[PDB]
């Protein structure tokens, strides 16, 4: 209908609870491997935040995998920062990690993150 | 909270 | 860190994508049965929005069930309205459904919905 | 959108 009321904080409260489930390893259904590092997550949150994971988990074979191995060129800290952003809306962007975060966001297909990385780099030129 | 969206 | 930047629309964009996955029946992992009606959903979204589903899906046996049957006194339209609220932040509250929505929200343990129902009822007294 | 939270 068009007569709905809306609870402003609902979406951010849902995301907070999804991150609490991730911290406690509750109903996590995939491990993402980035070289020597493993990250447990929920496939639905990954798909909802990344064009690459949306493609992977809508594929009729890959949707059933419990482990996904990323390209060896992907930096684990860059992936960790982006996984935290997926679950919190907060991006820990620093001079020492911006190149790795931007490269990881291009690979994961996260256009808003790629945008703010490009803007922060351009401001330092 | 609640608002008219 | 405390030096994060934040993307304002991220949480609402995640919730929109979770609702699109639900509409397309992508990676839904539970069917909620409410008398004669069935509703497919993602356990993590249900837990993130409801004290009852949080208790059910953190139980070591019930976490593995693919079907959950609700109490026969629960109204299917009331449940449908609340499931749509879980996935959108929008509550279709009307004179004809408020009693069923409030009863369903009390059973599901959704305190903000119970609150706005009580306020709308009190305004009509 | 991006802001300082
Ligand atoms: C179709 N497509 C969308 C993207 C994409 C690019 C990007 O920069 N960010 C994204 C962020 C999230 C997503 N996920 C979705 C997009 C549209 N509908 C659905 Cl159901 C999902 C999911 N789950 C997708 C993207 C790539 N291909
Ligand atoms: C511990 N507890 C919380 C509730 C609860 C009540 C209520 O009115 N609304 C809720 C809405 C959502 C939830 N889900 C959670 C609450 C706290 N931490 C986590 Cl990890 C979840 C999840 N997933 C829980 C509730 C009931 N018992
Ligand atoms: Cl596997
Ligand atoms: Cl993004
Ligand atoms: Cl079952
Ligand atoms: Cl609520």
């Amino acid at each position: 209908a068009d007569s709905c009321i809306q609870f402003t904080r609902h979406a951010s409260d849902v995301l907070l609870n999804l991150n609490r489930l991730r911290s406690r390893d509750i109903l996590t259904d995939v491990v993402i491997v980035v070289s020597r590092e493993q990250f447990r997550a929920h496939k639905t949150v990954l798909m909802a935040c990344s064009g690459l994971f949306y493609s992977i988990f809508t594929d009729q074979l890959k949707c059933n995998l419990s482990v996904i191995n990323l390209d060896p060129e992907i930096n684990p800290e860059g992936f960790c920062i982006l996984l935290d952003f997926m679950y919190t809306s907060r991006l820990n962007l620093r001079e020492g990690n911006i190149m790795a975060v931007m490269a990881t966001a291009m690979y994961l297909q996260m256009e808003h993150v790629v945008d703010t990385c490009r803007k922060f780099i351009k401001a330092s030129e | 909270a609640w608002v008219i969206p």
Side-chain angles (χ1 to χ4, degrees), chain A residues 1-8 10-59 61-118 120-121 123-125, chain B:
Chain A
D2 56 323
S3 62
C4 290
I5 51 175
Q6 175 172 277
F7 191 68
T8 303
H10 181 73
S12 53
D13 286 348
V14 168
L15 197 64
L16 176 69
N17 285 338
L18 296 173
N19 198 31
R20 289 166 168 168
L21 296 179
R22 182 178 64 122
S23 71
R24 295 162 61 191
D25 204 31
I26 295 170
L27 289 173
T28 50
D29 54 7
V30 72
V31 176
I32 308 302
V33 179
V34 189
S35 289
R36 291 181 181 270
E37 313 285 334
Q38 298 182 21
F39 298 90
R40 296 192 54 88
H42 302 97
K43 293 172 183 179
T44 52
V45 176
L46 296 181
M47 299 165 86
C49 298
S50 156
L52 183 74
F53 289 125
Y54 177 52
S55 296
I56 293 169
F57 300 124
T58 53
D59 177 83
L61 290 181
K62 303 186 183 75
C63 67
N64 287 323
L65 295 173
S66 63
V67 181
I68 298 294
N69 297 307
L70 305 189
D71 188 296
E73 293 199 36
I74 300 302
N75 181 257
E77 178 187 38
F79 183 75
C80 186
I81 288 166
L82 289 169
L83 183 62
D84 281 342
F85 167 74
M86 293 185 188
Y87 276 89
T88 67
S89 310
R90 291 174 184 225
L91 186 71
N92 182 22
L93 196 59
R94 297 174 64 88
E95 184 187 42
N97 70 31
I98 184 159
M99 302 308 292
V101 171
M102 186 173 70
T104 308
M106 290 169 61
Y107 170 76
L108 296 181
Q109 305 167 26
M110 296 171 72
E111 70 184 340
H112 304 296
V113 174
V114 177
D115 188 51
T116 194
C117 288
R118 285 197 178 126
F120 275 38
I121 292 162
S124 276
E125 289 171 355
Chain B
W2 292 91
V3 301
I4 302 296

